[PDB]
Structure 1
Amino acid sequence: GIALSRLAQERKAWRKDHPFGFVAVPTKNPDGTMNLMNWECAIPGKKGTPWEGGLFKLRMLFKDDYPSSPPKCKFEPPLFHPNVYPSGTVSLSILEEDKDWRPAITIKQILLGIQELLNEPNIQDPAQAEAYTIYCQNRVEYEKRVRAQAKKFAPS
């Protein structure tokens, strides 16, 4: 099918060349084969930012009409960030079909776009009250919270 052939292409591309320190791996079915509709991913914090040292786990869930539609990208556990909903779902315009999603966007581009969002929040379109309010009212406390979260999710 259209989704599965594109996702097999994306997997082969990712395995050969991907940004350093990221992870993107399909989950498995009971029979040991890959479930290309549900990927376990991880995004590293950028060096020189308060996110440095963290590795932040995310699930990427594809619908059967992918790549007409973007995947849903959900931090697990939910992330403290102004543009991450309490559910963990990421708000980003490239991840909305009727905003900036384009079918040609690759998994590398999605994960690099989420990485960029981490240290560059969009305060025009907040997704959670807590991280947004702290970002606006108390940047010192915001950075303390971010550095603590990065430590919590640092690889051992």
Structure 2
Amino acid sequence: SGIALSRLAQERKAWRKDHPFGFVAVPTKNPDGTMNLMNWECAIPGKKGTPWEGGLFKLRMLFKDDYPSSPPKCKFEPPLFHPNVYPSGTVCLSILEEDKDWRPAITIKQILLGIQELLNEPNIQDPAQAEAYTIYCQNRVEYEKRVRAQAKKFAPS
């Protein structure tokens, strides 16, 4: 637990000193108004020039006591239309899987950039929901319209 929290303090400090424009990552508030280092609320801007452009997509990041030996669990809230996002919101990504591409050196910044990258490059070998996967595979112009519509909806204003 202490190993996890020491790392999470370092992560928080580095994020505060330098994060990418439009991104948000802050420990969430416990019900008593304290903050919880093991549970962050985050936000990811759609990349420019892509149909995600203008959208801001919120997600939660949960760290376990054996972090950074294990990756955090990441979940969009609300759930998104995207081939690699489960109906629950959970994000399916290989650097987020302990038995695959996760390494302890991976930073929170790298996780959020890796998730942003996933938004515009769906991974067809690892679909997590029926609808976005089917439409992406069968009707790519309809896929792009749903994404654009969704990006419009999550436009902050």
Per-residue deviation at 1:125? 1.2
Give the whole-Å Cα distance in 1 for the aligned partners of 2:47 and 2:114: 12
Give matches, 1:32-43, under 5 Å: 32-43=33-44
Give the whole-Å Cα distance in 1 for the aligned partners of 2:4 and 2:156: 33
1:113 is paired with a residue of what secondary structure?
A: helix
Taking every aligned residue pair, what percent have the same amino acid on both sides? 99
Give me the CA root mean square deviation.
0.8
Q: State the partner residue of 1:130.
A: 131
Give matches, 1:6-25, under 5 Å: 6-25=7-26
Moved over 4 A (4+): none
Per-residue deviation at 1:70? 0.3
TM-score (norm 2): 0.97
Aligned residues: 156
Per-residue deviation at 1:33? 2.9
TM-score (norm 1): 0.98
Per-residue deviation at 1:30? 4.2
1:151 is paired with a residue of what secondary structure?
A: helix
Per-residue deviation at 1:28? 2.1
Give the whole-Å Cα distance in 1 for the aligned partners of 2:62 and 2:30: 15
1:116 is paired with a residue of what secondary structure?
A: helix
Q: Which runs of 5+ in 1 are unaligned?
A: none
Give the whole-Å Cα distance in 1 for the aligned partners of 2:87 and 2:107: 26
Q: Given the superposition, is the C-alpha separation of residues 137 and 35 from structure 1 closer, same or farther in structure 2, using an over 3 Å criterion? A: same
